[PDB]
Ligand binder design. Sequence first.
Ligand SMILES: CN(C)c1cccc2c(S(=O)(=O)N3CCCC[C@H]3C(=O)N[C@@H](CCc3ccccc3)C(=O)N[C@@H](CCCNC(=N)N)C(=O)O)cccc12
Length: 131
Amino acid sequence: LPMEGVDISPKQDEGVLKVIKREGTGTEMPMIGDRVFVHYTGWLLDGTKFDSSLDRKDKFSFDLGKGEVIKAWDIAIATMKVGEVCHITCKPEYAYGSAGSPPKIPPNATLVFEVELFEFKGEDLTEEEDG
Ligand SMILES: CN(C)c1cccc2c(S(=O)(=O)N3CCCC[C@H]3C(=O)N[C@@H](CCc3ccccc3)C(=O)N[C@@H](CCCNC(=N)N)C(=O)O)cccc12
């Protein structure tokens, strides 16, 4: 239900909002091209849970800043520290726009995600939380 956070969109048009729920440790944030490992839960503004990696056997991974994930994610994950838990509000322009993604995402939908950054694999260094 709530759309909260700092506007972190490069154009500064409130397209991507972020709230840190748990501060991460370290100082390093993943770079463009780094492989990032997260756990997430995604909800529509009406509180409807459309997807969660927690329901699966391992973390969700992809290469940062390569357009493999919605724009909002490439923006938001680049601002995360390892061990950080945040809430991201994604406006449709930074998500699935007017088309949506049937059947779980309707047209012009604002998405809410709770994301935890577990690890990132850089060119020379890998950074992860303990476990
Ligand atoms: C394909 N279908 C059925 C879905 C599978 C899985 C998740 C889906 C989600 S989700 O839960 O909101 N999700 C996962 C992580 C958070 C972001 C978001 C996401 O992003 N996903 C990717 C697809 C990931 C995937 C995972 C497993 C199997 C297949 C696909 C996605 O859409 N990429 C877009 C990006 C276009 C970016 N242009 C641009 N100009 N930067 C695409 O390349 O077309 C929502 C809707 C469909 C989901």
